[PDB]
mmCIF file of C-alpha atoms and ligand atoms in Angstrom:
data_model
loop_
_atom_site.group_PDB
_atom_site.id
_atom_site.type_symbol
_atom_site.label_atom_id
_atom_site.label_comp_id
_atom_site.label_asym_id
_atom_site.label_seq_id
_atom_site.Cartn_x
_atom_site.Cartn_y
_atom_site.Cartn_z
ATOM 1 C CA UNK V 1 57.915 32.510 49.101
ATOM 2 C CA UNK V 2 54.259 33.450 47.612
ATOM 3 C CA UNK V 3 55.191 32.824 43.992
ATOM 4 C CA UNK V 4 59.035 33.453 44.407
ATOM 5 C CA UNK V 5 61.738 31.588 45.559
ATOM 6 C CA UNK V 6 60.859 28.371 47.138
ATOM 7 C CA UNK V 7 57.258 26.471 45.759
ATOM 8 C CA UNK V 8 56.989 24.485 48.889
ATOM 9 C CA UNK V 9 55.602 27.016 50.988
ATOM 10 C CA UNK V 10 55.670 27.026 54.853
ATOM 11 C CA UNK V 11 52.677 26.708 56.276
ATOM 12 C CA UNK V 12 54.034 28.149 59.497
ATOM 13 C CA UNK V 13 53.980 30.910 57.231
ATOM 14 C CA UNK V 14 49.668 30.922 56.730
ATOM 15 C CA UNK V 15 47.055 31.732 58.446
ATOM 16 C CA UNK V 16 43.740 29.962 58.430
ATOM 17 C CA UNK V 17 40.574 32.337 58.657
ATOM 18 C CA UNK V 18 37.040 31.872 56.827
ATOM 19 C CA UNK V 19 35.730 28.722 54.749
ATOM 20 C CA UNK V 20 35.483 29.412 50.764
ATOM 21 C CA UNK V 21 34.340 26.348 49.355
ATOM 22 C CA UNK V 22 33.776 22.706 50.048
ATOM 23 C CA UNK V 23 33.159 19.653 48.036
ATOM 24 C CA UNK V 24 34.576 16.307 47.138
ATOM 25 C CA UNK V 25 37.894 18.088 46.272
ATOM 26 C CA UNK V 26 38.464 19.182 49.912
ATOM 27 C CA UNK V 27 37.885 22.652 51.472
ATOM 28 C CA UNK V 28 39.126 26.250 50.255
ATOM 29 C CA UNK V 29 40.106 28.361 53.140
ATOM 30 C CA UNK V 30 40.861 32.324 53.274
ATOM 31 C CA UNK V 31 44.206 33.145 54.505
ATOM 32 C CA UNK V 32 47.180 35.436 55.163
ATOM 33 C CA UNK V 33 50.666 34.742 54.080
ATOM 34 C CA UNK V 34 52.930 36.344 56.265
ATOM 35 C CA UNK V 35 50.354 38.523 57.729
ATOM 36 C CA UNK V 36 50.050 41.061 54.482
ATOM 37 C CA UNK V 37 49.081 39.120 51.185
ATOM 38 C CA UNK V 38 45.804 37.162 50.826
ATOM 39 C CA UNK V 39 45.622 33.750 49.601
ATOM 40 C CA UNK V 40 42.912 30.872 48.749
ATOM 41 C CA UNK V 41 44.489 27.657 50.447
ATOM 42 C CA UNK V 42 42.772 24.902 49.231
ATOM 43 C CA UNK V 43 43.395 21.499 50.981
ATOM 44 C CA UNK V 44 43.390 17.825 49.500
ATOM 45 C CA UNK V 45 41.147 15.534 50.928
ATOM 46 C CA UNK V 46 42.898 12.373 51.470
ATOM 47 C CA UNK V 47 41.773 9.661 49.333
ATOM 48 C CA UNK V 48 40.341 11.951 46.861
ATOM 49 C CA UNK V 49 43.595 12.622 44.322
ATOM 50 C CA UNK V 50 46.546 11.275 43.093
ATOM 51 C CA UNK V 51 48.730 13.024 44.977
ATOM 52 C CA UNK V 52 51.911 12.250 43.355
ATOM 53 C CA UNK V 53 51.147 12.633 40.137
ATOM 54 C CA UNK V 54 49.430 15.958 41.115
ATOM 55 C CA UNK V 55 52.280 16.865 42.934
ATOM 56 C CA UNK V 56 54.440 16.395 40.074
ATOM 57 C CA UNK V 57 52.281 18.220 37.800
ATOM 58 C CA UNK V 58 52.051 21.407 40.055
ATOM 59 C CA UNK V 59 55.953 22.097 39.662
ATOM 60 C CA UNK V 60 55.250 22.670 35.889
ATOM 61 C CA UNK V 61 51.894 24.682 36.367
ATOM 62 C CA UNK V 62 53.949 26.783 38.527
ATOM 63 C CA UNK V 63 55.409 28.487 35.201
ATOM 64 C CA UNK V 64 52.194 29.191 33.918
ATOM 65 C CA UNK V 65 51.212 32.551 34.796
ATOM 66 C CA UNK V 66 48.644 35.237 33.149
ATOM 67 C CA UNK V 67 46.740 38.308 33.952
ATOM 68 C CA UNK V 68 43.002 36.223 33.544
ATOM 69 C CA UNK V 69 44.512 32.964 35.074
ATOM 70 C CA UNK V 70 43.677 32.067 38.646
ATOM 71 C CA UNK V 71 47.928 32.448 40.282
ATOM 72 C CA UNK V 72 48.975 29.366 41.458
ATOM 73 C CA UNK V 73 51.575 30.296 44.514
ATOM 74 C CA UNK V 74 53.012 27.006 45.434
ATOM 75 C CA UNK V 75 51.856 24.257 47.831
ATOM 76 C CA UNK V 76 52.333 22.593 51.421
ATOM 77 C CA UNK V 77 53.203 18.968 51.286
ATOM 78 C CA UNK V 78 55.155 18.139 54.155
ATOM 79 C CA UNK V 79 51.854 17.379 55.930
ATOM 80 C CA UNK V 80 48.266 15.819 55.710
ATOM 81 C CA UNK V 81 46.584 16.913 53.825
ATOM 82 C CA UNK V 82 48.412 18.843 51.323
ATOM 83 C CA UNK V 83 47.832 22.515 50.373
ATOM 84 C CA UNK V 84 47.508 24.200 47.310
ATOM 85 C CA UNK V 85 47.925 27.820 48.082
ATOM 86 C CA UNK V 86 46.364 30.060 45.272
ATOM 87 C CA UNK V 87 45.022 32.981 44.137
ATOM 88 C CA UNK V 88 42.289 34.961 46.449
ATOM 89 C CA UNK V 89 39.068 36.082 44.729
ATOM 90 C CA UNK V 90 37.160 38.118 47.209
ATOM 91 C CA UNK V 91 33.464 37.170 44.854
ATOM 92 C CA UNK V 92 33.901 33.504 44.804
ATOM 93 C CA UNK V 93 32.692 31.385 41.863
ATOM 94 C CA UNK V 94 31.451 32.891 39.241
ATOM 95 C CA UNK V 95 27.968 30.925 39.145
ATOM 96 C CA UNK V 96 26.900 32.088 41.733
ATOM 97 C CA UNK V 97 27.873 35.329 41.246
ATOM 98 C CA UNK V 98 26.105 35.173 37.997
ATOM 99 C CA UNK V 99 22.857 34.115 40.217
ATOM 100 C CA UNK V 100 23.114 36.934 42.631
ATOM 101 C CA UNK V 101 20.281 39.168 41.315
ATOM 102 C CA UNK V 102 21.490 42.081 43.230
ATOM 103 C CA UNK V 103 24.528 42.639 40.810
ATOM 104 C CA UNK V 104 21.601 43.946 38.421
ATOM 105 C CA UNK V 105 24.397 43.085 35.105
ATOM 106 C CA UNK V 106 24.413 45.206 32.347
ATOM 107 C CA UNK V 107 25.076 43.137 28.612
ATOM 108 C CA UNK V 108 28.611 44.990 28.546
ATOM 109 C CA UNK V 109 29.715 43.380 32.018
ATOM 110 C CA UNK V 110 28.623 40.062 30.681
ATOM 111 C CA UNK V 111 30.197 40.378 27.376
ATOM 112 C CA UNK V 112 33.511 41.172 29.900
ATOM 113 C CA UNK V 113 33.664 38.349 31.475
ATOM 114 C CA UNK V 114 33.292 36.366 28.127
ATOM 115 C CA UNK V 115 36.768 38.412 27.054
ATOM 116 C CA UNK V 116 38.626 37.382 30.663
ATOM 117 C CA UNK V 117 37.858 34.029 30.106
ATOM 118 C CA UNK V 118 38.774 33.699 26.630
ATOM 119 C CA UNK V 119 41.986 35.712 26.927
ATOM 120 C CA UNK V 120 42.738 32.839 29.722
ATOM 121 C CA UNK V 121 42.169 30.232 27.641
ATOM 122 C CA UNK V 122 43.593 31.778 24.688
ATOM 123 C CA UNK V 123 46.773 31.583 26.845
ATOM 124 C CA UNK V 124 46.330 27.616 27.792
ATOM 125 C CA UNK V 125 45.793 26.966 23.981
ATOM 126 C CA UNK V 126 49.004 28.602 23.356
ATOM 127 C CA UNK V 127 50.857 26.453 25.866
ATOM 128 C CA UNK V 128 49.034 23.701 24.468
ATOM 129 C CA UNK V 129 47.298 23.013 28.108
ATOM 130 C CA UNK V 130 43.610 21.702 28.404
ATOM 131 C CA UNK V 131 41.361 23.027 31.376
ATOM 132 C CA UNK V 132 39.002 19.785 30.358
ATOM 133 C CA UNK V 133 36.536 21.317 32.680
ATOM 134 C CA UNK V 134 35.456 24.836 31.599
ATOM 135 C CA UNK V 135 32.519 25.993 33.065
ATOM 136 C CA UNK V 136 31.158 29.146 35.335
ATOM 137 C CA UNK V 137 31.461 27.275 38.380
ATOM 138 C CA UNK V 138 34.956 26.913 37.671
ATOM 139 C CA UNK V 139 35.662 30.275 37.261
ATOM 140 C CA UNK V 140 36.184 33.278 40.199
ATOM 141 C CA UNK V 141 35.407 37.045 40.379
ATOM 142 C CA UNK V 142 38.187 39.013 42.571
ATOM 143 C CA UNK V 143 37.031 42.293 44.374
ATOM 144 C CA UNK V 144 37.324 44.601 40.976
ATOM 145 C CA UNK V 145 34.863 41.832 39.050
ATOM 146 C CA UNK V 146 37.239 40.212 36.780
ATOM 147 C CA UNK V 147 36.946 36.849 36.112
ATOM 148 C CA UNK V 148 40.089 34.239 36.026
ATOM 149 C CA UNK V 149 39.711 30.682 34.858
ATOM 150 C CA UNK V 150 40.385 28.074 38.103
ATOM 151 C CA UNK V 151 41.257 24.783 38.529
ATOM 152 C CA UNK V 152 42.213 24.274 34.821
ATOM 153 C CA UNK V 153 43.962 20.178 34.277
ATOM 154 C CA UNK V 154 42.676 19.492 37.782
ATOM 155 C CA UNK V 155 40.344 16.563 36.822
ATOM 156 C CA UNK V 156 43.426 14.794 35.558
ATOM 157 C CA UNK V 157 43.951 13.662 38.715
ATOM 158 C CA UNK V 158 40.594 12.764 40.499
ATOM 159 C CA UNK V 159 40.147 9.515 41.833
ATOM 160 C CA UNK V 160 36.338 9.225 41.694
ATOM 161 C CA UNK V 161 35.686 7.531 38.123
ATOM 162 C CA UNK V 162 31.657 9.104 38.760
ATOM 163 C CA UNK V 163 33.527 12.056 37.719
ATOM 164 C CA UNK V 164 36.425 11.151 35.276
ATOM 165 C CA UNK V 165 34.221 8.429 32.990
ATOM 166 C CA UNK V 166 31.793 10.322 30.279
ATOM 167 C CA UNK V 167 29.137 8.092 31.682
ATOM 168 C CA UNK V 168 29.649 9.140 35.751
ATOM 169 C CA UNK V 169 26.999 11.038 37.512
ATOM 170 C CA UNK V 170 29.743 13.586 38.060
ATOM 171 C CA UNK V 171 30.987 14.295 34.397
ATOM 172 C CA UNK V 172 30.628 17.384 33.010
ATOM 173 C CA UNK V 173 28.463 16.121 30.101
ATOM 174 C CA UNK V 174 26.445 19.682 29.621
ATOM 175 C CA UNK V 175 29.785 21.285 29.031
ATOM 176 C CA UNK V 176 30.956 17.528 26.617
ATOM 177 C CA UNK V 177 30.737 17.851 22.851
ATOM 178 C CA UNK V 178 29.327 14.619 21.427
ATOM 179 C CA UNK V 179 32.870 13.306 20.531
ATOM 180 C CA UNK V 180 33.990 13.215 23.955
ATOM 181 C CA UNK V 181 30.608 11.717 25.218
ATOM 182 C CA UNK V 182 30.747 9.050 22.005
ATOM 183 C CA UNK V 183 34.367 8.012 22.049
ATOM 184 C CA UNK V 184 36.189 10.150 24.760
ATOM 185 C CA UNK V 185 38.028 12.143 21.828
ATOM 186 C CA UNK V 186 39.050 15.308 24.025
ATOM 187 C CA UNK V 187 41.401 18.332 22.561
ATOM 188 C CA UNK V 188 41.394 21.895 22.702
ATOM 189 C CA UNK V 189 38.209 22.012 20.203
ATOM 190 C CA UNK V 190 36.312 20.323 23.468
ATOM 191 C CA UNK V 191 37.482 23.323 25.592
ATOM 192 C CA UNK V 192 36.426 25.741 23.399
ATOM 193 C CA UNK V 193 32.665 23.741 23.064
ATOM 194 C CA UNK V 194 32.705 23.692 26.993
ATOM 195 C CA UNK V 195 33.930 27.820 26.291
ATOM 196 C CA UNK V 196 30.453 28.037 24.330
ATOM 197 C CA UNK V 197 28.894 27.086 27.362
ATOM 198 C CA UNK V 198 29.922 28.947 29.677
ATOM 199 C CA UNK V 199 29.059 32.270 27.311
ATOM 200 C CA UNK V 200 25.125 30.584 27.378
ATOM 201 C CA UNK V 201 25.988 30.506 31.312
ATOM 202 C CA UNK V 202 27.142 33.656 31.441
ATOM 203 C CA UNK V 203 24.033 34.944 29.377
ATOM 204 C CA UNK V 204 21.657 33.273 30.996
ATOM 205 C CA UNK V 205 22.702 34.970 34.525
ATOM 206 C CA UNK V 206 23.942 31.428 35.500
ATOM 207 C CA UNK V 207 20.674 28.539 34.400
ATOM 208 C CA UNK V 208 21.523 25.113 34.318
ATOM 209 C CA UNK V 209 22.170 24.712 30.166
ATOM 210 C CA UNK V 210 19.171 21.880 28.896
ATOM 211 C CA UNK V 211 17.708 22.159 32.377
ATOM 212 C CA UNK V 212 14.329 20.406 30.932
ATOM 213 C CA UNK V 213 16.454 17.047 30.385
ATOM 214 C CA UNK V 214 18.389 15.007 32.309
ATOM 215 C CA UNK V 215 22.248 14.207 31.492
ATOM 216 C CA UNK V 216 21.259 10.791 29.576
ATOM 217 C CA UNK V 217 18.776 13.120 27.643
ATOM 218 C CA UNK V 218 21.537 15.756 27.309
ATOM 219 C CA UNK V 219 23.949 13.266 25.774
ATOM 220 C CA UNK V 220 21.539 11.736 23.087
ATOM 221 C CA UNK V 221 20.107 14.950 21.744
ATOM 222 C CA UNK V 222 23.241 17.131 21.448
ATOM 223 C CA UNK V 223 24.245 14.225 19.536
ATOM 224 C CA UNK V 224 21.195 14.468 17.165
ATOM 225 C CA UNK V 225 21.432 18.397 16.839
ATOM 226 C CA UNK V 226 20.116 20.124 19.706
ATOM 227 C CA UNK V 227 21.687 23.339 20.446
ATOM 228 C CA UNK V 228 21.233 25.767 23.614
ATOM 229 C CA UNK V 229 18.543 28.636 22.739
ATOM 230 C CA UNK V 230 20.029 32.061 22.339
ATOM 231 C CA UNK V 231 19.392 33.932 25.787
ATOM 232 C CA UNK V 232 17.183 36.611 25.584
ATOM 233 C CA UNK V 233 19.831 38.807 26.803
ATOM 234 C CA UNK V 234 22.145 37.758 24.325
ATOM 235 C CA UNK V 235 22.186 39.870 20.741
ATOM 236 C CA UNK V 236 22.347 38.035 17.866
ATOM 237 C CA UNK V 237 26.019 38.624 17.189
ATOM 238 C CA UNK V 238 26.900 37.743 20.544
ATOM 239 C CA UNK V 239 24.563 34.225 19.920
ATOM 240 C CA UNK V 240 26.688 33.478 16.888
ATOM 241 C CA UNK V 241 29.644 33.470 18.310
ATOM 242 C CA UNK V 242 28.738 30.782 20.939
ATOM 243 C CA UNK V 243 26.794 28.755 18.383
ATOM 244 C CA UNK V 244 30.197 28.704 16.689
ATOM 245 C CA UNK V 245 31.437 26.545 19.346
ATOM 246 C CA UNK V 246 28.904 24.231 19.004
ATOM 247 C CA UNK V 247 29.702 22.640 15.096
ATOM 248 C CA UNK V 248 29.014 18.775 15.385
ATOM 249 C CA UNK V 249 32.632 18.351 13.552
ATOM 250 C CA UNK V 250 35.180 19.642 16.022
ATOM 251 C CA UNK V 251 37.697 21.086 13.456
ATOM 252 C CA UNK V 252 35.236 22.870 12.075
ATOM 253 C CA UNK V 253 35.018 25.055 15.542
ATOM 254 C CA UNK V 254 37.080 28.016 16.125
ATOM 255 C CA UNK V 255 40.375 28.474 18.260
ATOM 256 C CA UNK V 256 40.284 30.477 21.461
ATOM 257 C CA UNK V 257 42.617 33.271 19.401
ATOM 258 C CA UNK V 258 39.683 33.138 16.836
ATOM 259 C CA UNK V 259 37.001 33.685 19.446
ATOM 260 C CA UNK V 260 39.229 36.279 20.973
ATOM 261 C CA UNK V 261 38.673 38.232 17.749
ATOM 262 C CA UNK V 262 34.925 38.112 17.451
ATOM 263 C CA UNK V 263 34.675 38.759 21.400
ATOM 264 C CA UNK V 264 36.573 42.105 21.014
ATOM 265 C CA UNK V 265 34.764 43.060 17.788
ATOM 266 C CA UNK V 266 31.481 42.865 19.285
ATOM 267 C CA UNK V 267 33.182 44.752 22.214
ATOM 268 C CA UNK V 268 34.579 47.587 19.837
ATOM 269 C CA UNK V 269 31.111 48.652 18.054
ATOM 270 C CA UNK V 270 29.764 50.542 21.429
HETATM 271 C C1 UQX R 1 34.382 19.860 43.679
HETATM 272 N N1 UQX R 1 34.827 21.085 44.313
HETATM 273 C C2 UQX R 1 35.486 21.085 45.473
HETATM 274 O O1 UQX R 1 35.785 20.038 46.059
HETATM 275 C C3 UQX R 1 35.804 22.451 46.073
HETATM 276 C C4 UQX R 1 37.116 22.442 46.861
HETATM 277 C C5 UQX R 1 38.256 22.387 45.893
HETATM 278 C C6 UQX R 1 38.136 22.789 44.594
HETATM 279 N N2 UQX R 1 39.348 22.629 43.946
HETATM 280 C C7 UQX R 1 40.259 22.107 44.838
HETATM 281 C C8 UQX R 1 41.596 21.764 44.663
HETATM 282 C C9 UQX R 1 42.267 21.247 45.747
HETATM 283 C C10 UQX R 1 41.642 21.079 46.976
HETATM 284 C C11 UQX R 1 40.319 21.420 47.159
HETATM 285 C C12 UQX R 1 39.602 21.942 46.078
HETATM 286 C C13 UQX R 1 36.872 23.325 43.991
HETATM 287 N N3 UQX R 1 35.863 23.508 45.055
HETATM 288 C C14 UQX R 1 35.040 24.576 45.199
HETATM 289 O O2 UQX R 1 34.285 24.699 46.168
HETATM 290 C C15 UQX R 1 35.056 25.648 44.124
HETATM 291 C C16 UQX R 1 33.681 25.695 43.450
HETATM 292 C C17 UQX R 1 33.242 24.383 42.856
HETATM 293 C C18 UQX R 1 33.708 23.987 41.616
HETATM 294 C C19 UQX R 1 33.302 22.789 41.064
HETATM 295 C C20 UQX R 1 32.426 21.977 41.755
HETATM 296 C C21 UQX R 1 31.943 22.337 43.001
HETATM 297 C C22 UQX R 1 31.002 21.443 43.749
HETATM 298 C C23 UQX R 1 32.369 23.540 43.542
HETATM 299 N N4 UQX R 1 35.390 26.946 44.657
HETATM 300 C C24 UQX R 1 36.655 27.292 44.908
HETATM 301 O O3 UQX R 1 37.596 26.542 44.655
HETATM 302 C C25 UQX R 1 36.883 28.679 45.428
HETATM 303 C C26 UQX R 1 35.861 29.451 46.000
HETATM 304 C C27 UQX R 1 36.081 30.739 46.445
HETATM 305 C C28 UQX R 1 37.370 31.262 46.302
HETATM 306 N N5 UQX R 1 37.898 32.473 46.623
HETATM 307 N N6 UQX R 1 39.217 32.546 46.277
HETATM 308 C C29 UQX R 1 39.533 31.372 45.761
HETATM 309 C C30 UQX R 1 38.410 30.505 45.736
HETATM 310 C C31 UQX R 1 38.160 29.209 45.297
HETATM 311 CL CL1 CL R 2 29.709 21.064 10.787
HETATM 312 NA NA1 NA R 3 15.599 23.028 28.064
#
């Protein structure tokens, strides 16, 4: 079934309409599951993954489950390629989202979407689960705007070492504090720098963070003490709590619960 009963799902049982997304992953496809509920299916490209240990790994993720966490259903791998059949989020990624000028944000939606994703990753922490890829393109918007954290542990099993080394022309080294750039020490204080991020993302209606430097330029200076500018539309309060994510010495940097906190008192003075 679609997150009961069997985890295997049939794909007999889906239907294949419009294309979602595309890259080196695969391709995410719209679909129907049994005709009435709508799901993301988003297929493995061959040669991309290692499929057993992601296979493997998907049986566990199948207990996690949470209101701000993108619903993993089950998968389809009694073919090629194999399915992952997910959660559908009728406004995509939420980069782009963020980029669509139309939307016209006001600070309190922003400051929303900083709460869904914490309270997501406030979960993971709690389950002692790393996303090690946080960032607004890897998060989606469903059709009432709230935002869900996607694809969390996927990089754990991607093939292409351009996007697994902290040197690769793939990493995520704008989201990397300088720990996991220097020595590849990763841990839930390097989710919640990548968190920090994604709040200057979110602020920024979706600007590439140090967009004046290149990633070798990124890497040196963060190192030195550069920090991301406070956006203009950020307040000052809502600036320090990002800036908290950014200490050079990672156990100096708060927990997701922590960040939580300071989220929903900023929330709770309007
Ligand atoms: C490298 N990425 C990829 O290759 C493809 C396919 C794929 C992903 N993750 C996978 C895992 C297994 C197989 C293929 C993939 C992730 N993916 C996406 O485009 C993401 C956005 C994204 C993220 C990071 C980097 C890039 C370049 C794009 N969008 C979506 O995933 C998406 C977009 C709209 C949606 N609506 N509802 C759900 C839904 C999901
Ligand atoms: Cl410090
Ligand atoms: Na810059």
């Amino acid at each position: 079934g679609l997150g009961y009963g069997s985890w295997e799902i049939d794909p007999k049982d889906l239907t294949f309409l419009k294309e979602l997304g595309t890259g080196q992953f695969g391709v995410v496809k719209y679909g129907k599951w049994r005709g009435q509920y709508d799901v993301a299916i988003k297929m493995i490209k061959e040669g991309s993954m290692s499929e057993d240990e992601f296979i493997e790994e998907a049986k566990v993720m199948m207990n996690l489950s949470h209101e701000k966490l993108v619903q993993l259903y089950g998968v389809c791998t009694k073919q090629r390629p194999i399915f992952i059949i997910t959660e559908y989020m009728a406004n995509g990624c939420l980069l782009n989202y963020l980029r669509e000028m139309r939307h016209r944000f006001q600070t309190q939606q922003l400051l929303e979407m900083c709460k869904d994703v914490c309270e997501a990753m406030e979960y993971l922490e709690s389950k002692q689960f790393l996303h090690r890829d946080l960032a607004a393109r890897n998060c989606l918007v469903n059709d009432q705007g709230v935002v869900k954290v996607s694809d969390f542990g996927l990089s754990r099993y991607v093939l292409d070492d351009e996007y697994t080394s902290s040197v690769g022309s793939k990493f995520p080294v704008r989201w990397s504090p300088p720990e996991v750039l220097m020595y590849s020490k990763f841990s839930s204080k390097s989710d919640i720098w990548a968190f920090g991020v994604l709040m200057w993302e979110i602020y920024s209606l979706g600007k590439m963070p140090y967009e004046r430097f290149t990633n070798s330029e990124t890497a040196e200076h963060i190192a030195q003490g550069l920090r991301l500018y406070r956006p203009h539309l950020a307040s000052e309060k809502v600036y320090t709590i990002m800036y908290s994510c950014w200490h050079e010495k990672a156990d100096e940097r708060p927990t997701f619960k922590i960040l939580l906190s300071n989220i929903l008192d900023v929330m709770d003075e309007e």
